[PDB]
Design an enzyme around this catalytic site. Structure first.
Site, PDB file in Angstrom:
ATOM      1  N   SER A 299      31.159  45.374  -8.382  1.00 30.70           N
ATOM      2  CA  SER A 299      32.007  46.552  -8.456  1.00 30.70           C
ATOM      3  C   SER A 299      33.441  46.148  -8.165  1.00 30.70           C
ATOM      4  O   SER A 299      34.001  45.326  -8.895  1.00 30.70           O
ATOM      5  CB  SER A 299      31.516  47.607  -7.468  1.00 30.70           C
ATOM      6  OG  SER A 299      32.238  48.815  -7.607  1.00 30.70           O
ATOM      7  N   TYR A 300      34.059  46.686  -7.118  1.00 30.83           N
ATOM      8  CA  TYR A 300      35.404  46.211  -6.802  1.00 30.83           C
ATOM      9  C   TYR A 300      35.292  44.741  -6.461  1.00 30.83           C
ATOM     10  O   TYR A 300      36.136  43.930  -6.835  1.00 30.83           O
ATOM     11  CB  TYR A 300      36.047  46.968  -5.645  1.00 30.83           C
ATOM     12  CG  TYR A 300      37.547  46.779  -5.581  1.00 30.83           C
ATOM     13  CD1 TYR A 300      38.097  45.616  -5.076  1.00 30.83           C
ATOM     14  CD2 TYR A 300      38.413  47.764  -6.028  1.00 30.83           C
ATOM     15  CE1 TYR A 300      39.478  45.432  -5.025  1.00 30.83           C
ATOM     16  CE2 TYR A 300      39.787  47.598  -5.974  1.00 30.83           C
ATOM     17  CZ  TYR A 300      40.311  46.426  -5.472  1.00 30.83           C
ATOM     18  OH  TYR A 300      41.668  46.244  -5.410  1.00 30.83           O
TER      19      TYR A 300
ATOM     20  N   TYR B 141      34.175  42.093  -1.181  1.00 32.95           N
ATOM     21  CA  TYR B 141      34.350  43.436  -1.710  1.00 32.95           C
ATOM     22  C   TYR B 141      35.857  43.720  -1.783  1.00 32.95           C
ATOM     23  O   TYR B 141      36.417  43.923  -2.854  1.00 32.95           O
ATOM     24  CB  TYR B 141      33.573  44.511  -0.897  1.00 32.95           C
ATOM     25  CG  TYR B 141      33.643  45.850  -1.607  1.00 32.95           C
ATOM     26  CD1 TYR B 141      32.975  46.048  -2.811  1.00 32.95           C
ATOM     27  CD2 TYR B 141      34.448  46.881  -1.129  1.00 32.95           C
ATOM     28  CE1 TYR B 141      33.075  47.232  -3.493  1.00 32.95           C
ATOM     29  CE2 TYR B 141      34.544  48.081  -1.808  1.00 32.95           C
ATOM     30  CZ  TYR B 141      33.861  48.240  -2.992  1.00 32.95           C
ATOM     31  OH  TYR B 141      33.962  49.411  -3.681  1.00 32.95           O
TER      32      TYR B 141
ATOM     33  N   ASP C 202      25.868  51.747 -17.466  1.00 40.26           N
ATOM     34  CA  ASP C 202      26.724  52.013 -16.322  1.00 40.26           C
ATOM     35  C   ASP C 202      27.646  53.174 -16.635  1.00 40.26           C
ATOM     36  O   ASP C 202      28.550  53.039 -17.448  1.00 40.26           O
ATOM     37  CB  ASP C 202      27.563  50.781 -15.985  1.00 40.26           C
ATOM     38  CG  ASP C 202      28.128  50.833 -14.572  1.00 40.26           C
ATOM     39  OD1 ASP C 202      28.390  51.941 -14.064  1.00 40.26           O
ATOM     40  OD2 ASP C 202      28.292  49.769 -13.962  1.00 40.26           O
TER      41      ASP C 202
ATOM     42  N   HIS D  71      25.302  51.449 -12.596  1.00 40.66           N
ATOM     43  CA  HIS D  71      26.102  50.654 -11.684  1.00 40.66           C
ATOM     44  C   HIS D  71      25.268  49.971 -10.599  1.00 40.66           C
ATOM     45  O   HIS D  71      25.565  48.848 -10.191  1.00 40.66           O
ATOM     46  CB  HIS D  71      27.183  51.511 -11.043  1.00 40.66           C
ATOM     47  CG  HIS D  71      28.282  50.711 -10.427  1.00 40.66           C
ATOM     48  ND1 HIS D  71      28.980  49.752 -11.129  1.00 40.66           N
ATOM     49  CD2 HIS D  71      28.804  50.719  -9.178  1.00 40.66           C
ATOM     50  CE1 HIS D  71      29.894  49.213 -10.342  1.00 40.66           C
ATOM     51  NE2 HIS D  71      29.808  49.782  -9.153  1.00 40.66           N
TER      52      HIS D  71
HETATM   53  C1  LIG Z   1      31.896  56.549  -3.844  1.00 45.03           C
HETATM   54  C2  LIG Z   1      31.922  55.072  -3.986  1.00 45.03           C
HETATM   55  N1  LIG Z   1      31.043  54.468  -3.231  1.00 45.03           N
HETATM   56  C3  LIG Z   1      31.014  53.089  -3.347  1.00 45.03           C
HETATM   57  N2  LIG Z   1      30.219  52.235  -2.702  1.00 45.03           N
HETATM   58  C4  LIG Z   1      30.601  51.006  -3.195  1.00 45.03           C
HETATM   59  C5  LIG Z   1      30.052  49.830  -2.568  1.00 45.03           C
HETATM   60  O1  LIG Z   1      30.222  49.643  -1.343  1.00 45.03           O
HETATM   61  N3  LIG Z   1      29.515  48.886  -3.358  1.00 45.03           N
HETATM   62  C6  LIG Z   1      28.791  47.795  -2.622  1.00 45.03           C
HETATM   63  C7  LIG Z   1      28.471  46.687  -3.561  1.00 45.03           C
HETATM   64  O2  LIG Z   1      27.689  47.248  -4.579  1.00 45.03           O
HETATM   65  C8  LIG Z   1      28.481  47.997  -5.435  1.00 45.03           C
HETATM   66  C9  LIG Z   1      29.021  49.236  -4.717  1.00 45.03           C
HETATM   67  C10 LIG Z   1      31.612  51.045  -4.133  1.00 45.03           C
HETATM   68  N4  LIG Z   1      31.891  52.409  -4.238  1.00 45.03           N
HETATM   69  C11 LIG Z   1      32.860  53.059  -4.927  1.00 45.03           C
HETATM   70  C12 LIG Z   1      33.607  52.272  -5.887  1.00 45.03           C
HETATM   71  C13 LIG Z   1      34.897  51.848  -5.598  1.00 45.03           C
HETATM   72  C14 LIG Z   1      35.567  51.080  -6.549  1.00 45.03           C
HETATM   73  C15 LIG Z   1      34.907  50.757  -7.747  1.00 45.03           C
HETATM   74 CL1  LIG Z   1      35.671  49.831  -8.900  1.00 45.03          CL
HETATM   75  C16 LIG Z   1      33.652  51.158  -8.049  1.00 45.03           C
HETATM   76  C17 LIG Z   1      33.015  51.912  -7.117  1.00 45.03           C
HETATM   77 CL2  LIG Z   1      31.433  52.399  -7.498  1.00 45.03          CL
HETATM   78  C18 LIG Z   1      32.823  54.438  -4.891  1.00 45.03           C
HETATM   79  C19 LIG Z   1      33.825  55.279  -5.581  1.00 45.03           C
HETATM   80  N5  LIG Z   1      33.759  55.011  -6.962  1.00 45.03           N
END
Ligand SMILES: Cc1nc2nc(C(=O)N3CCOCC3)cn2c(-c2ccc(Cl)cc2Cl)c1CN
Ligand SMILES: *[C@@H]1O[C@H](CO)[C@@H](O[C@@H]2O[C@H](CO)[C@@H](O)[C@H](O)[C@H]2NC(C)=O)[C@H](O)[C@H]1NC(C)=O
Ligand SMILES: *[C@@H]1O[C@H](CO)[C@@H](O[C@@H]2O[C@H](CO)[C@@H](O)[C@H](O)[C@H]2NC(C)=O)[C@H](O)[C@H]1NC(C)=O
Ligand SMILES: Cc1nc2nc(C(=O)N3CCOCC3)cn2c(-c2ccc(Cl)cc2Cl)c1CN
Ligand SMILES: CC(=O)N[C@@H]1[C@@H](O)[C@H](O)[C@@H](CO)O[C@H]1O
Ligand SMILES: *[C@@H]1O[C@H](CO)[C@@H](O)[C@H](O)[C@H]1NC(C)=O
Ligand SMILES: *[C@@H]1O[C@H](CO)[C@@H](O)[C@H](O)[C@H]1NC(C)=O
Ligand SMILES: *[C@@H]1O[C@H](CO)[C@@H](O)[C@H](O)[C@H]1NC(C)=O
Ligand SMILES: *[C@@H]1O[C@H](CO)[C@@H](O)[C@H](O)[C@H]1NC(C)=O
Ligand SMILES: *[C@@H]1O[C@H](CO)[C@@H](O)[C@H](O)[C@H]1NC(C)=O
Ligand SMILES: *[C@@H]1O[C@H](CO)[C@@H](O)[C@H](O)[C@H]1NC(C)=O
Ligand SMILES: *[C@@H]1O[C@H](CO)[C@@H](O)[C@H](O)[C@H]1NC(C)=O
Ligand SMILES: *[C@@H]1O[C@H](CO)[C@@H](O)[C@H](O)[C@H]1NC(C)=O
Ligand SMILES: *[C@H]1O[C@H](CO)[C@@H](O)[C@H](O)[C@H]1NC(C)=O
Lengths: 727, 727
Positions: free
Chosen positions: B591-592, B508, B669, B701
């Site tokens: 995601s990230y 992540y 998404d 997403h």
């Molecule tokens: C509020 C928020 N919650 C999240 N949970 C995850 C997460 O752990 N995964 C776990 C693995 O599954 C995907 C989300 C990622 N995010 C992000 C987030 C951060 C960066 C990016 Cl680029 C996109 C998101 Cl959604 C955001 C804020 N946008």
């Protein structure tokens, strides 16, 4: 020793040469050699440099194409090309006076012009810009604005909207000069209530927010564009007063409901022919319209309308056939289905009943190519009874019984598939043979049908191919229910009936299609047979064209049935033959072929191990009205809604668990919408079937950008090579 | 002993039991058990059914949720739930009078209501319908209308827009009642000029034309929504006179530029706490606003403003921390980053400047959980020096050196990761242990921190797991330039340190993240280790959180930098270890985690055989402004444009020839737009790189529809298997 490789296909290592000339009189044509425009004398064959590659080296723009005024005084230069749909585009234009050997800078043609066209005689111009029509009598003079109603995406004057361009006219143009060059006829399309297809276009990396494309597009059963037809008198144009367009309304039998204007042919200087089609495409009317100098009006006597109907199918192959008028404009010939359902040339005299068949047989005429006082020239597939061949014939007008084959015997082993190009008034003709051997271009005189000279024999390519282990092609047929159905097979080098070969079925199989013919081709299948030693078959089953209506209309209102069945049965037939590995049989197809590939893959037949569908249709309500409704009627309960829904790919998802599937589609596909695949994948997800997929961002139905074109055929080759267990 | 199979994962064969309760008072809580709602006495554990499941067997609709007023007189019935974004949704609501034992049937809550809450005490309601706020004093009385400005997609009263929901308030609501129920605070958002993202939604097969979805969404650098804050007095409302809401104005130091409202806290009946943040999230101001009884106004004394700055990065882990006020509202506690860069608890007194640290050390306080006059309770990772563990601590407010661990030693083997839930006035508390053993919920009294009873021990699951070869987790660390960095490893059962195992790096690595921890999970990795004998590892390199700012802020203004490089070095380290097959190392993230995986595949390292990216970011100008700008600053020539441009995945496209890549994205998404994956693939095709893709029609997403969920993991599982030549 070496083969036809994938990189060869993608990189054009072995180039086919052609010879596209442009006639400019009954005895001269133009041609490009090293980007020099040469003009040729047809009779004696001598030439000279019409335009030097040198001119315009300091022009400022790269030149995209050119058009010469009939009277040779001027030339149109098209730059800043920007493609829209299959035929449309916008561009910028300049005019070069030839005698002044100078470039015109008065009253120039506007950038973003959508269409320009010289008058048939002289140096008049007509062009569309902002959906409006304009006319210059002379290239350095101000233009006369003809229409004022042009409006983006709503009102089109002199150009077509999306469906007319794709499915009706096969062109962007909706302008027709009278031969005199005195009248300009044009159509007006109204798309006010046509729904929009919407899709994302992502553009360059730099584009922060993706752009949304919106295109008026009617899907099966949705509201259609409407059409008006006008004629303007160019001789009578005022600098002060507006241009008066005279309208010609459609027949009352068309006015009662949705219909299309599907063909426009001038007969004389004062007679026009209009073809009209009912939205239900089993009925159409031809209207003969004559100018009246006393009133200035155009009148189409109901009495002389000609009328076409079908009880087994639709009208024409894809539309009502084109009329070819005798010089006096009092009669005309045109292809028509006879009492036995075969398409033959029919003779029509204006104010008289019925028509007269001048040809007949268990074969069909493909096109009427030329008409002089003593002769009608046409292409047919009569020779040897091979629906997949094409030859030029001429029929003696004053004795219909005397039919001469002009091409059958020129080179009977190399040449069995001809097309032709006649000069003005038909004094000379160019023959173009496309197979089974290398393409061959020759010139001929109409008088004694004498072979003047060879224009291009592709000798050079031929010397190269002697080096490579090329595949061969087998054109045969098989019998099903006492009926022959033709197929071809590209066979690998050194083919061996005592070996077992993997087999790919290359499918299209849409109505009036023909995949088994005598054309020579250097394509993806060449690579598959030459290098990977795969047999590539195709089969023309029910619904295929050029064999009579009995076969073509089998599929009437029943798409996704008999054509799907028959491809499967074809494969059972091939396994029967003893040189196919019935464990390694694949199927692939594009467009309509993608839809059929999917239906095949979804049939549970058990014949196919894996398949690829590219930009396939998935359910007919998603595709356009003119095409779809042509074959399926309307998707209402009182019409054909039942079969619209017994015939979707989605409803077959479960059966995909037995097969390996690759699904491909461009995101910017304006023709077969990404929707159709987006729904296929969802149906497969929803039922737990695993499959493989690829989207192509910003590509349309062609997926033809050089890089994408390379990517997809590469992607597909891996797929097939895995499936078949090849290195 | 069978193995933990993909199916077990997807069918949820082995289920974790929870114990979710809501504290209703200082000494009781509610608990849903078999659709029966129960009241529980904390001290004795005796209960009484508050609402039988039998009730509403005749209601008419499926009931999604419920909410009992603070006075236990009425209960809200939520039904017809439709989900919007991560927190938002709309629904219909009926109210049930618990005394009259019947559903109130007039002055109803409208359908398509966007948010409802009871006041903190009593039975007032506030709701949002069409972006406007309404208030009911009693459930059968007509509501008064608070705002009139609500307008779809433009003006939001009392609810958040897209970014605010996702990135600021982590909730749809923007309603805050005073503790009395006397006042209603709310925010109003104005997205007038916020650009819109647009994308296609294909709905069910029956939809003929896809829908274009359109959402105001500010991408990095674009126009941001603006905000206003108001408070209305709920007691003095009139039937004819429009209710009057008093506006609180952000501090002058905030108005000079774009800013955010990031937190709202009621301090007493008459004092509100508001925190603001600069669009450049360098700087935040906490305003303290008191009610003027005469004035009717609210005043925010500049002298009372508390300011947080950072010169090394941004303020707060993801936003300035929540303040926890003392009963009298004259002082509060707040998690603050200390001079050494560690986050510890700071004591603030309203009219005094600066503050006092209550804790210190090379570890961090994760959260302040409860506050009494005698003790402050908080969760931290101090215990045993592990940043990946969690414990409940209390600190004697009269002597800060007196800290006691409430959870460390309850069950040292089974439990190392706790969260907590206090009753009001914190008389009791529920501990929740998440691992490293099976989850375990317990009740406790604060008086002497006595263990009262066990709520759920997951003994059911334990029994079941005695019959499965479960994998194990190793949580260790490595050194990099003298710093410790943690990782964890899911190890196949019967792990032999002698053999070599293929290795999947699960990433992540987003700012302040943590993938190495002591929690128990049943997930994909469990399947991969248990059944397919793969080592699944995760690593927290630079940028990760809960270890001080030196580590977390390393990535300031340079995302796709050290966190990408550290994932690579971790892999190398893992090879050095003599039980990983260095020929078989894959990587994947969502995601990230998706972006990082891509940056890694495209880096050239040659470390990784292959990787999967799911809904990846590829370019920071495509993601939203609040998240992105927090770490990257603005994408202007004057600020951080260069690194925005340098940290695109597209620029690394060539390097992808060295690896096998699967790219996956949901077509719907709303969060990380398909645009981002559409641009990756285009860069891959443009440069002739082959790869695998899969889009998910109409998924967002989360790609969480039960069928999409199963399908993606199956697809991913084949790919991983293939990569590792796994039978
Ligand atoms: C509020 C928020 N919650 C999240 N949970 C995850 C997460 O752990 N995964 C776990 C693995 O599954 C995907 C989300 C990622 N995010 C992000 C987030 C951060 C960066 C990016 Cl680029 C996109 C998101 Cl959604 C955001 C804020 N946008
Ligand atoms: C194109 O067709 C549209 C749709 O019918 C025409 O719009 C209508 O025009 C008449 C006369 O102005 C009105 O009574 C209708 O209310 C209009 N309907 C709509 C949907 O606008 C339009 O006039 C046509 N345009 C041209 C130039 O032919
Ligand atoms: C939401 O914000 C927009 C933009 O700031 C405001 O739009 C302005 O409206 C006022 C009239 O009230 C004028 O100053 C301008 O004509 C508008 N400008 C634009 C860009 O439209 C709008 O007032 C705000 N709405 C609310 C409820 O505050
Ligand atoms: C005018 C037209 N020309 C075409 N050429 C091909 C073609 O051979 N393929 C196959 C090879 O690659 C390009 C398309 C298909 N079409 C179709 C067509 C027919 C049916 C369907 Cl369902 C869709 C289309 Cl576009 C149409 C009519 N719109
Ligand atoms: C002189 C004249 O009739 N020219 C007209 C012009 O006035 C008008 O703007 C346009 C649309 O009605 O048609 C043209
Ligand atoms: C061909 O030669 C004839 C006779 O010299 C000449 O009149 C004519 O202009 C030539 N045409 C071309 C195309 O060069
Ligand atoms: C076409 O546009 C370009 C500038 O975009 C200009 O050089 C040229 O003058 C334009 N032509 C006309 C007809 O105005
Ligand atoms: C062409 O025919 C039309 C129709 O009668 C006539 O009015 C016109 O004079 C002719 N034009 C020319 C230029 O010969
Ligand atoms: C042959 O006839 C049978 C019905 O007896 C039918 O199933 C099949 O479709 C027919 N095959 C062809 C190609 O005509
Ligand atoms: C109602 O409650 C009883 C226990 O008192 C339980 O056995 C039954 O399953 C419940 N009915 C439901 C869940 O609808
Ligand atoms: C629990 O028991 C006590 C003692 O009888 C009773 O007063 C109390 O109301 C009960 N609480 C619940 C939740 O049943
Ligand atoms: C709550 O506080 C407000 C402001 O101090 C006051 O006006 C109101 O009377 C209080 N409500 C009750 C019922 O105590
Ligand atoms: C430590 O030094 C290495 C040397 O290769 C460097 O690449 C890396 O950025 C540094 N890592 C840390 C934890 O600072
Ligand atoms: C909401 O609409 C539903 C049907 O969609 C209907 O039962 C009900 O009357 C409506 N409720 C209110 C009070 O808006």
């Amino acid at each position: 020793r070496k083969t036809y490789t994938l990189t060869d296909y993608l990189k054009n290592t072995y180039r086919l040469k052609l010879y596209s000339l442009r006639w400019i009189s009954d005895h001269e044509y133009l041609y490009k050699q090293e980007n020099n425009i040469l003009v040729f004398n047809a009779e004696y064959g001598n030439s000279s440099v019409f335009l030097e590659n040198s001119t315009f080296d300091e022009f400022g723009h790269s030149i995209n194409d050119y058009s010469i005024s009939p009277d040779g005084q001027f030339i149109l230069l098209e730059y800043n090309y920007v493609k829209q749909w299959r035929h449309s585009y916008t561009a910028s234009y300049d005019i070069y006076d030839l005698n002044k050997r100078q470039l015109i800078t008065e009253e120039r043609i506007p950038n973003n012009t959508q269409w320009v066209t010289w008058s048939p005689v002289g140096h008049k111009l007509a062009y569309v810009w902002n959906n409006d029509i304009y006319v210059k009598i002379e290239p350095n003079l101000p233009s006369y604005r003809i229409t004022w109603t042009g409006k983006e995406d709503i009102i089109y004057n002199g150009i077509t909207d999306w469906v007319y361009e794709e499915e009706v006219f096969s062109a962007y143009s909706a302008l027709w000069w009278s031969p005199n060059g005195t009248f300009l006829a044009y159509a007006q399309f109204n798309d006010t209530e046509v729904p929009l297809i919407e899709y994302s276009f992502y553009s360059d990396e730099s584009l922060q927010y993706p752009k949304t494309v919106r295109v008026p597009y009617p899907k099966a059963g949705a509201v259609n564009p409407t059409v008006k037809f006008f004629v303007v008198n160019t001789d009578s144009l005022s600098s002060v007063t507006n241009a008066t367009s005279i309208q010609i309304t459609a027949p009352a039998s068309m006015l009662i409901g949705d219909h299309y204007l599907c063909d426009v042919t001038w007969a004389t200087q004062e007679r026009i022919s209009l073809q009209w089609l009912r939205r239900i495409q089993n009925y159409s009317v031809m209207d003969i319209c004559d100018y009246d100098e006393s009133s200035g009006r155009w009148n189409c006597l109901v009495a002389r309308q000609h009328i076409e109907m079908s009880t087994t199918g639709w009208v024409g192959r894809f539309r009502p056939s084109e009329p070819h008028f005798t010089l006096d404009g009092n009669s005309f010939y045109k292809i028509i289905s006879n009492e036995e359902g075969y398409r033959h040339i029919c003779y029509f005299q204006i104010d008289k009943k019925d028509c007269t068949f001048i040809t007949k047989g268990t074969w069909e005429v493909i096109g009427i190519e030329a008409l002089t006082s003593d002769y009608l020239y046409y292409i047919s597939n009569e020779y040897k009874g091979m629906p997949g061949g094409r030859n030029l014939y001429k029929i003696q007008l004053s004795d219909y019984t005397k039919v001469t084959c002009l091409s059958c015997e020129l080179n009977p082993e190399r040449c069995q598939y001809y097309s032709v190009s006649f000069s003005k008034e038909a004094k000379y003709y160019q023959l173009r043979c496309s197979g089974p051997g290398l393409p061959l271009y020759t010139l001929h005189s109409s008088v004694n049908d004498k072979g003047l000279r060879v224009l291009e024999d592709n000798s050079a390519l031929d010397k190269m191919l002697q080096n490579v282990q090329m595949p061969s092609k087998k054109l045969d047929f098989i019998i099903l229910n006492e009926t022959k159905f033709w197929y071809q097979m590209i066979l690998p080098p050194h083919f061996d009936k005592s070996k077992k070969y993997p087999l790919l079925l290359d499918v299209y199989a849409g109505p009036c299609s023909q995949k088994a013919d005598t054309v020579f081709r250097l394509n993806w299948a060449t690579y598959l047979a030459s290098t990977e030693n795969i047999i590539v078959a195709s089969f023309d089953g029910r619904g295929s064209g050029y064999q009579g209506d009995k076969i073509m209309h089998a599929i009437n209102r029943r798409l996704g049935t008999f054509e799907v069945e028959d491809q499967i049965e074809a494969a059972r037939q091939f396994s029967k033959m003893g040189f196919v590995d019935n464990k390694r049989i694949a199927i692939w197809g594009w467009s309509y072929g993608g839809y059929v590939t999917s239906m095949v893959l979804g049939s549970g037949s058990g014949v196919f191990k894996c398949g690829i569908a590219v930009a396939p249709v998935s359910r007919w309500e998603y595709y356009d009205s003119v095409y779809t409704e042509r074959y399926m009627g309307l998707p209402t309960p009182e019409d054909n809604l039942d079969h619209y829904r017994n015939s979707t790919v989605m409803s077959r998802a479960e059966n995909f668990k037995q097969v390996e599937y690759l699904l491909i589609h461009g995101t910017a596909d304006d023709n077969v919408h990404f929707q159709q695949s987006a729904q296929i994948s969802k149906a497969l997800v929803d039922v737990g079937v695993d499959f493989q997929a690829m989207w192509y961002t910003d590509e349309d139905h062609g997926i033809a950008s050089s890089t994408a074109h390379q990517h997809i055929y590469t992607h597909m080759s891996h797929f097939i090579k895995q499936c078949f267990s090849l290195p």
